[PDB]
Amino acid sequence: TDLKASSLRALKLMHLATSDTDENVIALCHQAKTPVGNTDAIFIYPRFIPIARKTLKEQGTPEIRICTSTNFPHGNDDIDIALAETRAAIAYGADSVAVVFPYRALMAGNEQVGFDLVKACKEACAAANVLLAVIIETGELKDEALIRKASEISIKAGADNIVTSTGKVAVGATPESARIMMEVIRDMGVEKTVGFIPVGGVRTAEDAQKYLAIADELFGADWADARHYAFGASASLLASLLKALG
């Protein structure tokens, strides 16, 4: 009931992903409706959104959200491409669009493109009541200084959520990137409008418990509700969570 309590609460914070074909999206939606309850969302490729929305409706769980990704996984610095992709994500049906920050451009000293890209995508999401999450790719940024700066620029440009990772490079979330990023939320005073999402690095019920207690110590135990905290993860975190719940 410390581990059982936080396992329940983490499972309900999950953004469940594959690991995409039509038959796998389907099984995913089924995977997300568990016997102790539902993850908050699934996370899939935009093309698969209509089919997932249906599967989720048919199975009694319309309230499970559908999150998706754009400029992904590379985080190139073409704004037009990142924006048109975002516009289509929205048109497909997405509740949230996770856009990859142009982190290579920041590493080469250009902060402005990150700012304008995030902001271009936010205006379109906002217009459509879709959340805009920003993946900064901590495992490629690597330096605390760059993790901090990507995070701030994303927030200055209107990110509703900041996310460690794509899940497509070697290093996802670490306790340290996650802390650095949440510290930026705290340091800008934006806890009310910006949530956080580790991707990678949470594999066990005990991991999730650790990551949530970092948010709880920084902001109090009430902060990490589903709007402000998600575990971007896959079937195996979910099975560990469920294992610790019996």
Residues that bind ligand 3NY (CB under 6 A): 15, 17, 43, 67, 96, 98, 131, 133, 161, 163, 197, 199, 230, 232
- Of the pair 4, 191, the CB lying nearest ligand 3NY is at 191
Residue 69 CB, shortest distance to ligand 3NY, in Å, is 6
Please say which residue, 7 or 166, places its beta carbon nearer to ligand 3NY.
166
Tell me which residue has its CB nearest to ligand 3NY: 133
CB 64 within 8 A of CB 29: yes
Strand order through the sheet with 41-43:
195-197, 161-163, 131-135, 96-100, 65-70, 41-43, 14-17, 231-234
Minimal distance in Å, beta carbon 215 to ligand 3NY? Answer: 16
Q: Compute the least distance from the CB of residue 2 to ligand 3NY, in Å.
A: 25
Instruction: Select 164 or 240, whichever has its Cβ closest to ligand 3NY.
Output: 164
Query: Minimal distance in Å, beta carbon 23 to ligand 3NY?
Result: 21
Residue 67: CB minimum distance to ligand 3NY, A: 4
Q: How many CB atoms lie within 10 A of CB 240?
A: 21
- For ligand 3NY, the closer of residues 146 and 195 by Cβ is 195
Helices and strands counted in the chain (H then E): 11, 10
Q: How far is the CB of 86 from ligand 3NY (least distance, A)?
A: 11
Closest CA to 84 of 73, 99, 74, 95: 99
Q: Name which of 188, 245, 175 is nearest 217 in CA terms.
A: 175
Contact by Cβ (8 Å): 41, 67: yes
- Decide whether 52 or 230 has the Cβ nearer to ligand 3NY: 230
**Cβ proximity to ligand 3NY, 4 vs 127, nearer residue:** 127
Instruction: Point out which residues pair with 135 in neighbouring strands.
Output: 100, 163
Contact status, residue 186 vs residue 218, Cβ threshold 8 Å: yes
